[PDB]
Design an enzyme around this catalytic site. Structure first.
Site, PDB file in Angstrom:
ATOM      1  N   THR A  21       0.669  -1.312   0.000  1.00 16.31           N
ATOM      2  CA  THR A  21       0.000   0.000   0.000  1.00 16.31           C
ATOM      3  C   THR A  21       0.670   1.314   0.000  1.00 16.31           C
ATOM      4  OG1 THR A  21      -1.549  -0.913   1.351  1.00 16.31           O
ATOM      5  CG2 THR A  21      -1.566   1.309   1.727  1.00 16.31           C
TER       6      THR A  21
HETATM    7  C1  LIG Z   1       0.099  -2.512   0.721  1.00 17.61           C
HETATM    8  C2  LIG Z   1      -0.465  -3.468  -0.311  1.00 17.61           C
HETATM    9  C3  LIG Z   1       1.279  -3.154   1.492  1.00 17.61           C
HETATM   10  O1  LIG Z   1       1.426  -4.547   1.279  1.00 17.61           O
HETATM   11  C4  LIG Z   1      -1.047  -2.128   1.753  1.00 17.61           C
HETATM   12  O2  LIG Z   1      -0.585  -2.008   3.058  1.00 17.61           O
HETATM   13  C5  LIG Z   1      -2.251  -3.082   1.884  1.00 17.61           C
HETATM   14  C6  LIG Z   1      -3.316  -2.380   2.735  1.00 17.61           C
HETATM   15  C7  LIG Z   1      -4.621  -2.835   2.633  1.00 17.61           C
HETATM   16  C8  LIG Z   1      -5.573  -2.202   3.411  1.00 17.61           C
HETATM   17  C9  LIG Z   1      -6.892  -2.595   3.367  1.00 17.61           C
HETATM   18  C10 LIG Z   1      -7.256  -3.634   2.527  1.00 17.61           C
HETATM   19  C11 LIG Z   1      -6.316  -4.279   1.741  1.00 17.61           C
HETATM   20  C12 LIG Z   1      -4.990  -3.878   1.808  1.00 17.61           C
HETATM   21  N1  LIG Z   1      -1.920  -4.231   2.711  1.00 17.61           N
HETATM   22  C13 LIG Z   1      -2.226  -5.472   2.377  1.00 17.61           C
HETATM   23  O3  LIG Z   1      -2.788  -5.783   1.355  1.00 17.61           O
HETATM   24  C14 LIG Z   1      -1.822  -6.517   3.378  1.00 17.61           C
HETATM   25  C15 LIG Z   1      -0.305  -6.523   3.636  1.00 17.61           C
HETATM   26  C16 LIG Z   1      -0.165  -7.330   4.740  1.00 17.61           C
HETATM   27  C17 LIG Z   1      -0.216  -8.685   4.550  1.00 17.61           C
HETATM   28  C18 LIG Z   1      -0.116  -9.516   5.632  1.00 17.61           C
HETATM   29  C19 LIG Z   1       0.014  -9.001   6.900  1.00 17.61           C
HETATM   30  O4  LIG Z   1       0.108  -9.852   7.939  1.00 17.61           O
HETATM   31  C20 LIG Z   1      -1.054 -10.677   8.058  1.00 17.61           C
HETATM   32  C21 LIG Z   1       0.067  -7.641   7.107  1.00 17.61           C
HETATM   33  C22 LIG Z   1      -0.030  -6.810   6.015  1.00 17.61           C
HETATM   34  N2  LIG Z   1      -2.254  -7.850   2.942  1.00 17.61           N
HETATM   35  C23 LIG Z   1      -3.108  -8.598   3.660  1.00 17.61           C
HETATM   36  O5  LIG Z   1      -3.614  -8.243   4.709  1.00 17.61           O
HETATM   37  C24 LIG Z   1      -3.424  -9.964   3.092  1.00 17.61           C
HETATM   38  C25 LIG Z   1      -4.829  -9.928   2.522  1.00 17.61           C
HETATM   39  N3  LIG Z   1      -3.355 -10.985   4.154  1.00 17.61           N
HETATM   40  C26 LIG Z   1      -2.919 -12.225   3.930  1.00 17.61           C
HETATM   41  O6  LIG Z   1      -2.540 -12.586   2.827  1.00 17.61           O
HETATM   42  C27 LIG Z   1      -2.914 -13.090   4.946  1.00 17.61           C
HETATM   43  C28 LIG Z   1      -2.490 -14.399   4.832  1.00 17.61           C
HETATM   44  C29 LIG Z   1      -2.644 -14.946   6.098  1.00 17.61           C
HETATM   45  C30 LIG Z   1      -2.393 -16.167   6.552  1.00 17.61           C
HETATM   46  C31 LIG Z   1      -2.617 -16.487   7.880  1.00 17.61           C
HETATM   47  C32 LIG Z   1      -3.107 -15.513   8.722  1.00 17.61           C
HETATM   48  C33 LIG Z   1      -3.348 -14.263   8.194  1.00 17.61           C
HETATM   49  C34 LIG Z   1      -3.114 -14.003   6.912  1.00 17.61           C
HETATM   50  C35 LIG Z   1      -3.274 -12.895   6.199  1.00 17.61           C
HETATM   51  C36 LIG Z   1      -3.806 -11.603   6.774  1.00 17.61           C
END
Ligand SMILES: *[C@@](C)(CO)[C@](*)(O)[C@H](Cc1ccccc1)NC(=O)[C@H](Cc1ccc(OC)cc1)NC(=O)[C@H](C)NC(=O)C1=CC2=CCC=CC2=C1C
Ligand SMILES: [Mg+2]
Lengths: 231, 235, 240, 211, 233, 195, 244, 222
Positions: free
Chosen positions: D1
């Site tokens: 992001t």
């Molecule tokens: C930018 C894309 C940086 O990567 C930005 O911060 C976006 C912000 C955002 C805000 C609102 C909606 C969508 C996106 N961040 C992400 O897309 C974010 C990055 C991130 C990934 C994972 C973590 O730790 C969990 C923190 C930040 N992506 C996610 O949240 C994705 C959707 N999560 C996962 O792929 C995920 C896999 C997984 C496995 C086990 C437990 C939790 C898990 C998660 C949250």
């Protein structure tokens, strides 16, 4: 007299007056009828209104796809007990993948009501319940009293003027038990039974409440123009 | 003495029955339900002329689609309103939608019988809960301290209730407009109130699908009072 | 724990314990609240049965809840400390979580809620106290005056009195206080507050306490001599 | 992001990207990173998507309750503080949230930065996420208080574009918002692929890229 | 969190036209030590269900008692305990599955892999697996531990899909199970020659066979094998 | 946060605190006020782990303000510093300690004396003529040891403070974005808007 | 159940009084008189022991006057056992304050704390109140010398001179008559003893029937000394003032 | 040390039509290199015209579906048999997932049905409760294989109209249920070829105003 101040006190003749007073609240309540055949089980309930502007208090509550009850007395107490049944029916499904037996449901209600009759501070439940259901041993009808006593019956009725409907069912016993594979005729017998408990008022479209459960019939409630067929 | 959850020989809870007597002493509140909306009106009943009457809040917003009027020991209602507001908003959080008026009323009534030896006594206040949802439309409920709730086309609670209810019996029909309902509440309030009805000692409110729950201004109510006087003098 | 339900309904629909708490308020010393155009004044009676008192250290009748809100009372003195302490804690808790000081209406609503809670909680009795809560909201020049009572009901007042012989001073205020034109200045507001207490007090010496609260956290308590000048001027006009 | 938000003469601009990643895999092309708490309150999302959605949707519950109890809209300062206090309960438990609470209240326009550590900062301009450094570059050199609504919307849009281009974990599309004293106004979803080429031609920027 | 101490190896099973078969050896291993040679790991529940368990034996004994207690509890206030309201294989399984998943969610698992084999009221075959993680699945053939790797391939040649079940007789199915057990004795280092086998048929009921032995074993070809490459003598 | 300094002169206490706040590799703010007024004549600056600093400061602020209202009286700087130390000493053995270092500058109206207390996150309290937390003292204490007199004016204290900040700006690797300076004397608390 | 036997100690009368508080005050009215007099240069505490015996060991005895800390003392009227429960709580509160703020506790703050504890027993818990009334004599650097009293209701007030226990009506009249603002400690000592001598139910006032204490700045330079009088010292001050 | 999580493989796919929606998933269940079952259903009819699939760790997936099905039951009890809308179900599931923020359900969850205007709807969740409405979504083992194909063949990404040379895009014409099922089958046939955890069978649940229909298709068993 001196022995009716709480539920923890026997009278000199071995009576529990608070329980008897809770039983009295059922007699003040509106009439409801229960009856069954070998294939189906039916509830019929006369709903009561506060006045002409008011709605008619609901009497029948669904507990599961295969079980439910009708109430007479304190409605909030019926909500508490029916909520408990919903949870127990649900615990049986989630843990054992098993539909709760109607007989066992009665045993659970009995034991829940009993605890309120032996302990200080609490009070007995002020409502009577007619539980119908269809399980692995066919159709069933139960009568619940807040004393704790639960009774399996072919037919019965509770509430004000319930003795008239109960006598009718006692005569009709041999007829309505044989009404197998015909839901409409079994309801007719129930509507004709509850009619023996009416005075002055008659069965109108927003007055009458009917419920049914059976072999290939989930527990469903009929109100409004859905019961005009049976008036 | 005797238990708080004790049954009388007639099969009624003493405390619940006694709380109903406290509600009879409360100021009058009236609700009328129509197909154009639900109207809620109350008697303010200030104990002295030095009391700033606009601080008397006996009509209250629960959500944008649900309003509420009270009668009896009004201090008891604050925690009921707080619970109602929380329930309404919490459901919106869990389900991304408005909560049904009946479901809200049921949630309030679940508190009622949570008393014993939980709170130490039943509530000493009755509530008229009015609202709108997509499933059952415009609705008016009467929530008691017994835990029971009845739906009503029209209902009056408080000291002038049985006199007002008899009047509502004759006046209500299924084709009432909102304007007609407003005047009807004012008419019946003026009838049962001790002091002369005006914009300062009585308050109106309504709930419509479009605009939601609104408490009426004193200037707006004053005009409806003047419109009432003229139409009664018209025959 | 002690769970006994002390506040309960009676056959006629009354909660006697709450009503008997109002009798304790009736016994308490008189307190009065008058709001002017740009101020609020809180007057309080001091019973002169107690002399040889140390007035420096004796608990004053008017208590600051925050820098912009004050609270006076009538009834059980010990009970009032508990409400004041709770109110003061909530005032700092509101500043801490919302970053604004409490509104007078909010503080009143909280104190009234506490009083209400003690009318339907097991093992406790109602507060034998009615309060007058006055002040000015942050960045607002409109005066605020509220009353509470043991039952937990609260409301706003142009002017109000509580305590013993409050019936008499309320009678005085109802005929003397004009809503269309309230006491324009501080002098007029204090004068009307002292006049009202002189209907009940006895001697105008150390029996009358006055506390003036102005906007923007400007709160001061008048001294004996300052009040005595009001007492002198009132009676000299009365001799006519 | 990449997210940004800044105050100016005519309120506050809020611009975010829409990319979501699960490692190097682009899980989502178009994710909403703005929450509509109320007509006068917005919230940006950076970090764990689940944490951002849950806690900000819960803040909106608490902000709505504030309106019901007080009959008055919550301030941006108070809203931001409620959120920071939530983060403080789960102190060290592993929440990943970086948000900007944007709104208009009685003090005028308001902008607060809030993160999982409990940090709460007031300011004129903020930017969060993996591409915040690229956005700050454009913002700092072109920002003025005297900006027009049209030019300010473009600045925020152009600042996200800069980050979407360079940062691999930023992209997809641009969501624009403009907060006025009559509430927020959505200014559309803008695909970066199309926007990039458009800006390149019109502005003359990105000369090093071929098209 | 623990580690398994005394353990039981493969449990194998399959469906056939009128019911199900299940089998497991009678060994309780203590690491590489073949400590206990008389352990029964097939446990019948009524006359319509057999629960086969592998893994930690102390946890097996615990489960065995939960089941014994379940039968006792089902009979309470139940006139139809030996008829309509008797325990079904699906009831027994779901109970265990509930317990297994709860225990893993408290980070204190029952270190087992369980196969519940039985026949339902309506004559339908029941065969489902559950393990220490609370993971459940069903298939025409099921096996735990080594059986999953070696037995399933052999049993799937008989019943490869659902449509092969009506075509499979009890004689063919038992033959396949007994052969699979022989293969496991050849190749599993924590297996034994002695085993138990249970058949639950919708017609002939529950047949429980004890003290079975692996027979018709091929070893003679070993005499010709000399050295590890170049050695001739 | 980074740098917090303190110096007690003849008739006042002067606190200087950095303006920077950093998240990851980016400086989010360059105008942050790392201080809270506990009472009209008592000021507390703070530095430590993110979030914890402000919560702790605001928690202390609330407690002292509550005391002030209850007693209608301002606690002495010594009493406040002792209250703060106890809260930190209580905290250090908690499940999750608050990682905050503070300087408390106050003017005792009873004794008519300025007072400076230095307290670290363990609850280690010391009264000093001049103090600092973290690495700040490594660069500045040599100058203060040399130039400090107890009879210094407020203007002389500010000049010596400028010299300390200049040395920090020359030899520290981190850019702390200058300092906000505040003076605590008999007349209360005021901020030096040009520094 | 148990409700049957509950006295309900925390309820209002129809007149708006607390039954148990009123009855506790009735108990206290039969207790030995205790007097406190505040002067410009110190405070006096005088109290009468109740009908003693010749075989009572007086020099090791303490029923009236107690030390809370170096700056504050109390005179007791009522149940001694009840008073000791409260006294030990007060001693702890003083030490808690000293540990927290590194300053001796202001007198009023200590008094309010004890009075708040007494208040609690009148509003919740269902327990009987403490049958005790205190006179607090203390010093701090804010208000200087201070006298307070508290009773079972939890209400407290400040005084120049005050009495608790038996014959307070008579005692308060005598104090109100002879007390003046410019009074000194030596004069206040004489007033206290003269008042007890006239209000006592005993035939004569002797050393063995008295407990006595002063709080003086009569300590070498700016500091405060507590003096709990010994039996022989009470005997001397009785001769000095001309009572025996 | 005990590891409370596992990986049962599998892959799921949801596509939203104009007046319909599909939720497909393979029927293979695995651990490591072994096959547990060639037919273990993974997509479920949860009632109220809603279908659901929790892909990843089967034990957590089965528990979540079980709980949501239960949540639907209690929604009827508590709110007068009201139909649970797809948007309301989605928000409910978010809260079910976040209940275990610190011990998550290791599953990627998808649901499908119709919105209140009758149009097709698909909602996608991460393991900790982030959700969003989508038109197209693949989840699980072969998600990265399938999604790019759907971007191209469902939303016509990188596709332009011949003759214009990149100036005019391919217009976003709607897809029929027959056309969608073709794309689903080709997606899984392709995934089966290159992913070892995908195979055996393919079960598709189609949702329309008329109800929920099933279709099954064999896949390669190697
Ligand atoms: C930018 C894309 C940086 O990567 C930005 O911060 C976006 C912000 C955002 C805000 C609102 C909606 C969508 C996106 N961040 C992400 O897309 C974010 C990055 C991130 C990934 C994972 C973590 O730790 C969990 C923190 C930040 N992506 C996610 O949240 C994705 C959707 N999560 C996962 O792929 C995920 C896999 C997984 C496995 C086990 C437990 C939790 C898990 C998660 C949250
Ligand atoms: Mg494959």
């Amino acid at each position: 007299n001196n022995y009716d101040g709480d539920t923890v006190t026997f009278s000199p003749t071995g009576r529990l007056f608070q329980v008897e007073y809770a039983l009295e609240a059922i007699k003040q309540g509106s009439v409801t009828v229960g009856l069954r055949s070998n294939t189906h089980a039916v509830l019929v309930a006369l709903k009561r209104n506060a006045d002409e502007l008011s709605s008619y208090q609901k009497k029948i509550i669904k507990c599961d796809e295969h079980m439910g009850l009708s109430l007479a007395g304190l409605a909030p107490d019926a909500r508490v007990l029916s909520n408990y049944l919903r949870q127990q029916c649900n615990y049986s499904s989630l843990v054992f993948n098993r539909k709760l037996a109607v007989e066992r449901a009665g045993h659970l209600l009995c034991d829940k009501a009993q605890k309120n009759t032996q302990s200080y501070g609490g009070r007995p439940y002020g409502v009577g319940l007619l539980i119908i259901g269809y399980d692995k041993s066919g159709a069933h009808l139960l009568e619940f009293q807040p004393s704790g006593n639960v009774t399996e019956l072919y037919g019965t009725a509770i509430g004000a003027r319930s003795q008239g409907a109960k006598t009718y069912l006692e005569r009709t016993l041999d007829t309505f038990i044989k009404i197998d594979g015909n839901p409409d005729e079994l309801i007719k017998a129930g509507v004709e039974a509850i009619s023996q408990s009416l005075r002055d008022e008659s069965l109108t479209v927003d007055n009458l409440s009917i419920a049914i459960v059976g072999k290939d019939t989930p527990f469903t409630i009929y109100d409004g123009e859905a019961v005009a067929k049976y008036i | 003495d005797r238990g708080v959850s004790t049954f009388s020989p007639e099969g009624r809870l003493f405390q619940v029955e006694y709380s109903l007597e406290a509600i009879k002493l409360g100021s009058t509140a009236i609700g009328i339900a129509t197909k154009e909306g639900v109207v809620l009106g109350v008697e303010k009943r200030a104990t002295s002329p030095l009391l700033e009457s606009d601080s008397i809040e006996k009509i209250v917003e629960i959500d944008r689609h649900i309003g509420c009027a009270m009668s009896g020991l009004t201090a008891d209602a604050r925690s009921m309103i707080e619970h109602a507001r929380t329930a309404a908003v919490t459901h919106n959080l869990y389900y991304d939608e408005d909560i049904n008026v009946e479901s809200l009323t049921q949630s309030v009534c679940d508190l009622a019988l949570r008393f014993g030896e939980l709170m130490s006594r039943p509530f000493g206040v009755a509530l008229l809960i009015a609202g709108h949802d997509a499933d059952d439309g415009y609705q008016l409920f009467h929530a008691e301290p017994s835990g029971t709730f009845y739906r009503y086309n029209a209902k009056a609670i408080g000291s002038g209730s049985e006199g007002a209810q008899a009047e509502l019996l004759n006046e209500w029909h299924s084709s009432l407009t909102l304007k007609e309902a407003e005047l009807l509440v004012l008419k019946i309030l003026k009838q049962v109130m001790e002091e002369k009805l005006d914009e300062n000692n009585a308050q109106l409110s309504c709930i419509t699908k479009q605009d939601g729950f609104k408490i009426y201004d004193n200037e707006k109510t004053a005009e409806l009072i003047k419109e009432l006087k003229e139409k009664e003098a018209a025959e | 724990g002690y769970d006994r339900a002390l506040s309960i309904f009676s056959p006629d629909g009354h909660i006697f314990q709450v009503e008997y708490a109002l009798e304790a308020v009736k016994r308490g010393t008189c307190a009065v609240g008058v709001k002017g155009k740009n101020c609020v004044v809180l007057g309080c009676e001091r019973r002169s049965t107690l002399k040889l008192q140390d007035t420096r250290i004796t608990p004053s009748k008017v208590s600051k809840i925050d820098s912009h809100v004050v609270l006076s009372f009538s009834g059980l003195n010990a009970d009032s400390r508990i409400l004041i302490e709770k109110a003061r804690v909530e005032a700092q808790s509101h500043r801490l979580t919302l970053e604004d000081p409490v509104t007078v209406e909010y503080l009143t609503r909280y104190v009234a809620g506490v009083q209400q809670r003690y009318t339907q909680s097991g093992g406790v009795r109602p507060f034998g106290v009615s309060t007058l809560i006055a002040g000015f909201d942050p960045r607002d020049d409109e005066p605020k005056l509220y009353q509470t009572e043991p039952s937990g009901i609260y409301s706003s007042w142009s002017a109000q009195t509580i305590g013993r012989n409050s019936k008499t001073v309320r009678e005085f205020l109802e005929k003397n206080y004009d809503r269309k034109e309230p006491p324009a200045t501080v002098e007029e507001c204090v004068k009307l507050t002292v006049r009202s207490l002189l209907e009940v007090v006895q001697t105008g010496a150390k029996n009358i306490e006055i506390t003036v609260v102005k906007p923007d956290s400007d709160i001061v308590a008048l001294s004996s001599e300052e009040i005595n000048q009001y007492v002198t001027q009132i009676e000299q006009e009365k001799q006519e | 992001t990449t997210t940004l938000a800044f105050k100016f003469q005519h309120g506050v601009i809020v611009a975010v990207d829409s990319r979501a990643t699960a490692g190097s895999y682009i899980s989502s092309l178009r994710m909403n990173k703005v929450i509509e708490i109320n007509p006068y309150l917005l919230g940006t999302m950076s970090g764990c998507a689940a944490d951002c959605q849950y806690w900000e949707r819960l803040l909106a519950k608490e902000c709505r309750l504030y309106y019901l109890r007080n009959g008055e809209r919550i301030s941006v300062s108070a809203a931001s503080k409620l959120l920071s206090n939530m983060m403080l309960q789960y102190r060290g438990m592993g929440l990943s949230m970086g948000s900007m609470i944007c709104g208009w209240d009685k003090k005028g326009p308001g902008l607060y930065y809030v993160d999982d550590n409990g940090t709460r900062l007031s300011g004129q301009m903020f930017s969060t996420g993996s591409g915040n450094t690229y956005a700050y570059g454009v913002l700092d050199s072109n920002y003025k208080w005297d900006l027009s609504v049209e030019d300010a919307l473009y600045l925020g849009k152009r600042s996200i574009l800069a980050a979407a281009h360079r940062d691999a974990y930023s992209g997809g599309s641009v969501n624009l918002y403009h907060v006025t004293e009559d509430g927020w106004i959505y200014h559309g979803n803008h695909d970066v692929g199309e926007l990039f080429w458009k800006v390149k031609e019109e502005e003359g920027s990105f000369n090093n890229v071929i098209g | 969190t623990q580690q398994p101490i005394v353990t039981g190896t493969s449990v194998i099973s399959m469906k056939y036209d009128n019911g199900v078969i299940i089998a497991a050896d009678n060994l309780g291993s203590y690491g590489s030590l073949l400590r206990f040679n008389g352990v029964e790991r097939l446990i019948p529940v009524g006359d319509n269900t057999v629960v086969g368990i592998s893994g930690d034996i102390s946890d097996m004994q615990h489960i065995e008692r939960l089941l014994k207690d379940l039968v006792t509890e089902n009979a309470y206030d139940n006139p139809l305990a030996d008829a309509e309201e008797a325990l079904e294989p699906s009831y027994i399984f779901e109970y265990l599955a509930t317990v297994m998943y709860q225990r893993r969610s408290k980070m204190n698992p029952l270190w087992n892999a369980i196969i519940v084999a039985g026949v339902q009221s309506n004559g339908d075959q029941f065969l489902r697996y559950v393990n220490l993680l609370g993971v459940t699945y069903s298939s025409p053939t099921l096996a735990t531990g080594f059986g999953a790797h070696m037995a399933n391939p052999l049993l799937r040649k008989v019943v490869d899909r659902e449509s092969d079940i009506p075509k499979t007789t009890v004689q063919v199915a038992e033959e396949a199970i007994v052969n699979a057990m022989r293969v496991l004795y050849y190749r599993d280092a924590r297996s034994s020659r002695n085993f138990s086998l249970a058949i639950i048929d919708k017609n002939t009921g529950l047949t429980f066979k004890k003290n079975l032995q692996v027979e018709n074993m091929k070893w003679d070809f070993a005499k010709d094998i000399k050295g590890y490459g170049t050695q001739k003598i | 946060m980074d740098i917090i300094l303190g110096i007690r002169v003849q008739d006042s206490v002067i606190l200087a605190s950095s303006k920077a706040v950093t998240r990851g590799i980016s400086v989010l703010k360059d105008s942050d006020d790392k201080t809270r007024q506990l009472s009209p004549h008592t000021l507390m600056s703070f530095a430590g782990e993110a979030g914890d600093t402000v919560q702790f400061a605001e928690y202390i602020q609330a407690n002292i303000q509550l005391y002030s209202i209850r007693e209608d009286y301002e606690l002495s700087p010594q009493a406040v510093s002792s209250f703060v130390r106890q809260e930190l000493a209580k905290s250090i053995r908690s499940r999750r300690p608050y990682q905050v270092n503070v300087l408390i500058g106050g003017y005792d109206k009873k004794k008519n004396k300025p007072e400076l207390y230095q307290i670290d996150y363990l609850g280690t309290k010391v009264e000093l003529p001049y103090g600092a937390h973290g690495y700040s003292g490594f660069y500045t204490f040599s100058l203060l040891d040399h130039h400090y007199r107890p009879d210094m004016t407020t203007e002389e204290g500010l000049d010596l403070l400028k010299l300390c900040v200049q040395e920090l700006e020359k030899r520290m690797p981190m850019d702390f974005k200058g300092v906000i300076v505040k003076i605590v004397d008999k007349d209360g608390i005021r901020q030096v808007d040009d520094f | 159940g148990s409700r049957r036997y509950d006295s309900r100690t925390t309820i209002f009368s129809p007149e708006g009084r607390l039954y148990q508080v009123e009855y506790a005050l009735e108990s206290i009215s039969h207790a030995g008189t205790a007097i406190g007099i505040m002067a410009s240069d110190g405070i006096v505490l005088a109290a009468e022991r109740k009908v003693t015996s010749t075989l009572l060991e007086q020099d090791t005895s303490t029923e009236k006057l107690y030390k809370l800390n170096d700056k504050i003392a109390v005179a007791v009227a009522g149940l001694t056992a009840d008073a000791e429960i409260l006294i030990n709580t007060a001693r702890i509160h003083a030490q808690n304050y000293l540990k927290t703020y590194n300053e001796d506790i202001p007198v009023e703050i200590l008094v309010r704390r004890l009075s708040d504890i007494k208040q609690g027993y009148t509003q919740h818990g269902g327990l009987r109140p403490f049958g005790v009334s205190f006179i607090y004599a203390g010093y701090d650097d804010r208000y200087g010398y201070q006298l307070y009293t508290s009773n079972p209701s939890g209400n407290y007030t400040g005084w120049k001179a005050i009495s608790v226990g038996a014959n307070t009506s008579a005692a308060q009249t005598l104090l109100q008559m002879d007390y003046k603002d410019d009074m000194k400690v030596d004069d206040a000592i004489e007033l206290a003893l003269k008042t007890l001598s006239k209000t006592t139910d005993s035939s004569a006032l002797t050393y063995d029937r008295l407990e006595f204490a002063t709080i003086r700045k009569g300590a070498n330079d700016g500091e405060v000394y507590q003096k709990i009088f010994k039996p022989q010292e009470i005997k001397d001050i009785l001769v000095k003032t001309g009572i025996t | 040390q005990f590891n409370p999580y596992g990986d049962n493989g599998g892959t799921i796919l949801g596509i939203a039509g104009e007046d319909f929606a599909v939720l497909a998933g393979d029927t293979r269940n695995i651990t490591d290199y072994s096959i547990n079952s060639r037919y273990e259903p993974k997509v479920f009819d949860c009632g109220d015209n809603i279908v659901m699939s929790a892909n990843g760790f089967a034990a957590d997936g089965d528990a979540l579906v079980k709980r949501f099905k239960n949540s639907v039951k209690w929604y009827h009890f508590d709110h007068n048999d009201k139909k649970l809308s797809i948007n309301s179900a989605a928000r409910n599931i978010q809260h079910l997932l976040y209940s275990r923020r610190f011990f998550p359900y290791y599953v990627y969850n998808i649901i499908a049905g119709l919105d209140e205007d009758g149009k097709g709807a698909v909602y996608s969740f991460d393991p900790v409760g982030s959700y969003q409405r989508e038109q197209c979504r693949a989840g699980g083992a072969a998600a990265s294989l399938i999604m790019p194909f759907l971007d191209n063949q469902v939303n016509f990404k990188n596709q332009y109209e011949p003759g214009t040379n990149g100036k005019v895009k391919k217009p976003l014409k709607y897809l029929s249920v027959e056309e969608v099922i073709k794309l689903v089958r080709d997606s899984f046939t392709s995934a089966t070829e290159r992913h070892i955890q995908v195979g055996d069978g393919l079960e598709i649940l189609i949702v329309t105003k008329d109800g929920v229909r099933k279709e099954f298709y064999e896949l390669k068993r190697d």
